[PDB]
Amino acid sequence: ESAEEVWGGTEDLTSLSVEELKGLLARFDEEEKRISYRRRVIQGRIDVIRAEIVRRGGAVLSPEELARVLMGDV
Amino acid sequence: TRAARESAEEVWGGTEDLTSLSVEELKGLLARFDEEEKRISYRRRVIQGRIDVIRAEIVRRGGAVLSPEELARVLMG
Ligand SMILES: Nc1nc2c(ncn2[C@@H]2O[C@@H]3COP(=O)(O)O[C@H]4[C@@H](O)[C@H](n5cnc6c(=O)[nH]c(N)nc65)O[C@@H]4COP(=O)(O)O[C@H]3[C@H]2O)c(=O)[nH]1
Ligand SMILES: Nc1nc2c(ncn2[C@@H]2O[C@@H]3COP(=O)(O)O[C@H]4[C@@H](O)[C@H](n5cnc6c(=O)[nH]c(N)nc65)O[C@@H]4COP(=O)(O)O[C@H]3[C@H]2O)c(=O)[nH]1
């Protein structure tokens, strides 16, 4: 929370100390871990939604075809 | 890879069986999902942009200093 604002008024980084950067880094890292996770998940759910469109209906996908779809070829 | 799944109470919130959705609805869901995907990938970009900037500054001055002793224990067990 305090990370979003301090990073906006801190202007340049030398004004901070190392043990303060370790703090900004920590609270910005996991926010990136879960935003990237949430990203890859919905990105994968899009490849199966688009793949579903071309299989015309209730396409149950064998573990064989899921690999192809998840790479990008839906 | 675990903390994300815990706070991911909204990523699998009201999801539906994609093999049950009708062809018409799939296109309607593709639109909604395509908009959040492009919005989370931007916030992702600007965020990881900060991280690289702050990680560079740290390494520049003090850095990830880890005494060869403690580091050995990390690699050992
Ligand atoms: N449906 C779907 N969409 C996807 C997938 N992966 C990425 N996208 C979306 O489409 C764009 C992908 O561009 P790219 O040609 O992979 O081009 C990417 C890629 O070249 C690079 N990039 C971003 N993150 C990474 C990463 O973690 N690793 C690598 N190697 N390149 C990355 O930055 C470019 C722009 O990324 P963004 O701004 O996020 O823009 C991304 C994102 O909005 C996927 O598997 N499925
Ligand atoms: N072509 C393409 N491939 C993609 C894209 N998004 C993800 N990938 C692939 O999927 C892997 C996992 O990405 P993640 O789970 O978001 O995990 C990512 C993400 O969390 C993070 N990352 C990616 N780019 C940056 C960056 O510029 N700064 C920081 N701090 N982290 C980054 O590190 C991991 C990157 O791992 P990579 O070795 O790049 O490995 C990436 C890359 O191989 C994309 O848009 N386009």
Numbering used by the authors:
A (entry chain T): 28 to 101
B (entry chain D): 23 to 99
The publication says:
The RsiG–WhiG cognate pair is the only known example of a σ–anti-σ complex that is targeted by c-di-GMP. Here we show that the same σ–(c-di-GMP)–anti-σ switch has been co-opted during evolution to regulate distinct biological functions in unicellular and filamentous bacteria, controlling type IV pilus production in the genus Rubrobacter and the differentiation of reproductive hyphae into spores in Streptomyces. Moreover, we show that the anti-σ likely originated as a homodimer and evolved to become a monomer through an intragenic duplication event. Structural analyses revealed that these single-motif RsiGs form an antiparallel coiled-coil through homodimerization, enabling them to bind c-di-GMP in the same manner as the monomeric twin-motif RsiGs.
Thus, to elucidate how a single-motif homodimeric RsiG interacts with c-di-GMP and its partner WhiG protein, we solved the crystal structure of the R. radiotolerans (Rr) RsiG bound to c-di-GMP and Rr WhiG to 2.93-Å resolution. The R. radiotolerans complex contains one WhiGRr molecule, a c-di-GMP dimer, and a RsiGRr homodimer. In the complex, the RsiGRr forms the same antiparallel coiled-coil homodimer as observed in the apo RsiGRr structures. Because no c-di-GMP was added prior to crystallization, the c-di-GMP molecules seen in the Rr (RsiG)2–(c-di-GMP)2–WhiG structure copurified with the complex from the E. coli expression system. The bound c-di-GMP dimer is coordinated by two RsiGRr E(X)3S(X)2R(X)3Q(X)3D repeat motifs, with the same arrangement of contacts as observed in the Sv RsiG–(c-di-GMP)2–WhiG structure, but again, in this case each motif is provided by each subunit of the RsiGRr homodimer. However, in contrast to the S. venezuelae structure, which shows no contacts from the WhiG σ4 domain to c-di-GMP, the WhiGRr σ4 domain makes extensive contacts to the c-di-GMP. As noted, in the R. radiotolerans structure the WhiGRr σ4 domain is shifted relative to the S. venezuelae structure such that it directly abuts the c-di-GMP molecules, positioning residues Thr237, R239, and K243 from the α11 helix of σ4 to directly contact the bound c-di-GMP dimer. In addition, the Rr RsiG homodimeric coiled-coil, though similar to the coiled-coil in the RsiGSv monomer, lacks the long interfacing loop seen in RsiGSv. Instead, RsiGRr employs N-terminal and C-terminal extensions from its coiled-coil to bind WhiGRr. The Rr (RsiG)2–(c-di-GMP)2–WhiG structure revealed how sequence-identical regions of the two RsiG subunits can flexibly adopt different conformations, allowing them to interact with distinct WhiGRr σ2 and σ4 domains.
